[PDB]
Design an enzyme around this catalytic site. Structure first.
Site, mmCIF file in Angstrom:
data_model
loop_
_atom_site.group_PDB
_atom_site.id
_atom_site.type_symbol
_atom_site.label_atom_id
_atom_site.label_comp_id
_atom_site.label_asym_id
_atom_site.label_seq_id
_atom_site.Cartn_x
_atom_site.Cartn_y
_atom_site.Cartn_z
ATOM 1 N N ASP A 1 2.036 12.251 1.498
ATOM 2 C CA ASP A 1 2.070 12.180 0.023
ATOM 3 C C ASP A 1 1.805 13.485 -0.746
ATOM 4 O O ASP A 1 1.335 13.454 -1.885
ATOM 5 C CB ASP A 1 1.145 11.058 -0.484
ATOM 6 C CG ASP A 1 1.640 9.673 -0.100
ATOM 7 O OD1 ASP A 1 0.789 8.791 0.164
ATOM 8 O OD2 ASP A 1 2.879 9.463 -0.055
ATOM 9 N N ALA B 1 0.797 -1.238 0.000
ATOM 10 C CA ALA B 1 0.000 0.000 0.000
ATOM 11 C C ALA B 1 0.829 1.288 0.000
ATOM 12 O O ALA B 1 0.616 2.173 -0.838
ATOM 13 C CB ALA B 1 -0.992 0.003 1.166
ATOM 14 N N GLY C 1 4.194 1.298 -0.162
ATOM 15 C CA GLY C 1 5.466 1.007 -0.810
ATOM 16 C C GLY C 1 6.276 0.030 0.017
ATOM 17 O O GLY C 1 5.722 -0.884 0.639
ATOM 18 N N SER C 2 7.592 0.219 0.013
ATOM 19 C CA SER C 2 8.486 -0.597 0.820
ATOM 20 C C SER C 2 8.697 0.084 2.173
ATOM 21 O O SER C 2 9.715 0.744 2.405
ATOM 22 C CB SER C 2 9.810 -0.821 0.091
ATOM 23 O OG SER C 2 10.507 -1.924 0.642
ATOM 24 N N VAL C 3 7.712 -0.073 3.055
ATOM 25 C CA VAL C 3 7.718 0.580 4.364
ATOM 26 C C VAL C 3 7.757 -0.437 5.508
ATOM 27 O O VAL C 3 6.995 -1.410 5.519
ATOM 28 C CB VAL C 3 6.505 1.546 4.539
ATOM 29 C CG1 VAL C 3 6.521 2.215 5.914
ATOM 30 C CG2 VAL C 3 6.501 2.613 3.446
HETATM 31 F F1 LIG Z 1 7.671 5.596 5.628
HETATM 32 C C1 LIG Z 1 7.684 6.890 5.271
HETATM 33 C C2 LIG Z 1 8.839 7.643 5.504
HETATM 34 C C3 LIG Z 1 8.879 8.991 5.147
HETATM 35 C C4 LIG Z 1 7.757 9.580 4.560
HETATM 36 C C5 LIG Z 1 6.604 8.823 4.328
HETATM 37 C C6 LIG Z 1 6.555 7.475 4.688
HETATM 38 O O1 LIG Z 1 5.401 6.745 4.449
HETATM 39 C C7 LIG Z 1 4.548 6.308 5.443
HETATM 40 C C8 LIG Z 1 3.551 5.361 5.162
HETATM 41 C C9 LIG Z 1 2.676 4.913 6.165
HETATM 42 C C10 LIG Z 1 2.814 5.423 7.458
HETATM 43 C C11 LIG Z 1 2.105 5.167 8.636
HETATM 44 C C12 LIG Z 1 1.031 4.293 8.872
HETATM 45 C C13 LIG Z 1 1.229 3.204 9.725
HETATM 46 C C14 LIG Z 1 0.194 2.307 10.000
HETATM 47 C C15 LIG Z 1 -1.056 2.500 9.416
HETATM 48 C C16 LIG Z 1 -1.259 3.586 8.565
HETATM 49 C C17 LIG Z 1 -0.223 4.480 8.302
HETATM 50 CL CL1 LIG Z 1 -0.525 5.856 7.197
HETATM 51 N N1 LIG Z 1 2.667 5.936 9.594
HETATM 52 N N2 LIG Z 1 3.719 6.674 9.041
HETATM 53 C C18 LIG Z 1 3.806 6.362 7.738
HETATM 54 C C19 LIG Z 1 4.664 6.807 6.739
#
Ligand SMILES: Fc1ccccc1Oc1ccc2c(-c3ccccc3Cl)[nH]nc2c1
Length: 343
Positions: free
Chosen positions: A162, A30, A32-34
């Site tokens: 985003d 969803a 990306g690579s997180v």
């Molecule tokens: F991982 C990231 C680093 C820097 C900028 C943006 C990034 O993208 C996310 C993607 C999901 C993220 C969540 C998240 C964690 C669990 C459920 C929903 C969400 Cl939106 N918290 N922080 C996030 C950050």
């Protein structure tokens, strides 16, 4: 330089500083690579994003630079910013991976909302507009605001994801298009930052009713849903549609008056209704701005003009620049190396 350790996770090798422990993939695909992680240095639960093939092409290298620049600029409670950025590379020569670190949130607005209380709507929309005032003050447009890129913690504290960043995923009965302002959905014109205010209107309506405001089955069906609520455009707005093709189609449509929003949002706070009317205006020139919306009587219990900060200026001149892969890569690298963590 910290010590880095290696680990296979999202089918790939993550190489991160030791401070980041207990790495675990979140929302598989969803975002990306997180990975979720614990930052032992700050005591914060963090989200770490590994950029997929950042310098594969010119377009990829530029958007890697774009994302890093945008994330580095944002310093606001209601906007996702950068806690850290790192690469395992010791030089520009071996530089090929970018890792971004931000706060870990609980969930997105989608999987949390069905019709909320008016007090929760007030607080959630206030935070979105507070963050948007900040973003817009830097001359940045989000362009794709929707419940899925609004992230919330357990205290209902909210951050916008985003900001400033295919035809098939905009096609059909899809949430990717439901929050788009009509002028951007059909490319009527050069659009302003109030495309994001339209999206807020759509989001706010959904929080209040528990229902998608304009769940179109396609671009055209959605336009008809929009124009039924807000009315067909008058001559004034038709002139502003520089796309002669789009203008010509609109004039083929049966004229409709704007609906009574009090008859659409039955039982809702009359101040909520008034604000929706000001956000969901067909002519983008006449939509309420984020700064104006924050001063609206609907947000009386939260509004504080000394606690709604603006952003430093954001130089986006690079957007007009045509550079080579290695040039975007070098600029990206400078930005990584020059990063200073927040206090
Ligand atoms: F991982 C990231 C680093 C820097 C900028 C943006 C990034 O993208 C996310 C993607 C999901 C993220 C969540 C998240 C964690 C669990 C459920 C929903 C969400 Cl939106 N918290 N922080 C996030 C950050």
């Amino acid at each position: 330089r910290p010590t880095f350790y290696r680990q296979e996770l999202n089918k790939t090798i993550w190489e991160v500083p030791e401070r980041y422990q207990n790495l675990s993939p979140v929302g598989s695909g969803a975002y990306g690579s997180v990975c979720a992680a614990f930052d032992t240095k700050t005591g914060l639960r963090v989200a770490v994003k590994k950029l997929s093939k950042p310098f594969q092409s010119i377009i990829h290298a530029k958007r890697t630079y774009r994302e890093l620049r945008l994330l580095k600029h944002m310093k606001h409670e209601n906007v996702i910013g950068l806690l850290d950025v790192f690469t395992p590379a010791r030089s520009l020569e071996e530089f090929n991976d970018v890792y971004l670190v931000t706060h870990l949130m609980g969930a997105d607005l989608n999987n949390i909302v069905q019709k909320l209380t008016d007090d929760h709507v007030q607080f959630l929309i206030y935070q979105i507009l507070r963050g948007l005032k900040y973003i817009h003050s830097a001359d940045i447009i989000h362009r794709d605001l929707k419940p899925s890129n609004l992230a919330v913690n357990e205290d209902c504290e909210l951050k916008i994801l985003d900001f400033g960043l295919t035809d098939d995923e905009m096609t059909g009965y899809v949430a990717t298009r439901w929050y788009r302002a009509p002028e951007i959905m059909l490319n009527w014109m050069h659009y302003n930052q109030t495309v994001d205010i339209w999206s807020v209107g759509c989001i706010m309506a959904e929080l209040l009713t528990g229902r998608t405001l304009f769940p179109g089955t396609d671009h055209i069906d959605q336009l008809k849903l929009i124009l039924r609520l807000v009315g067909t455009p008058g001559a004034e707005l038709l002139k502003k549609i520089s796309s002669e093709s789009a203008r010509n189609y609109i004039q083929s449509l049966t004229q409709m008056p704007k609906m009574n929003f009090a008859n659409v949002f039955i039982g809702a706070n009359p101040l909520a209704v008034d604000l929706l009317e000001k956000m969901l205006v067909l002519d983008s020139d006449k939509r309420i701005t984020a700064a104006q919306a924050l001063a609206h009587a609907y947000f009386a219990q939260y509004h504080d003009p000394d606690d709604e900060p603006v952003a430093d200026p954001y130089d986006q001149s690079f957007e007009s620049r045509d550079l080579l892969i290695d040039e975007w890569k070098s600029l990206t690298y400078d930005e990584v190396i020059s990063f200073v963590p927040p206090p």
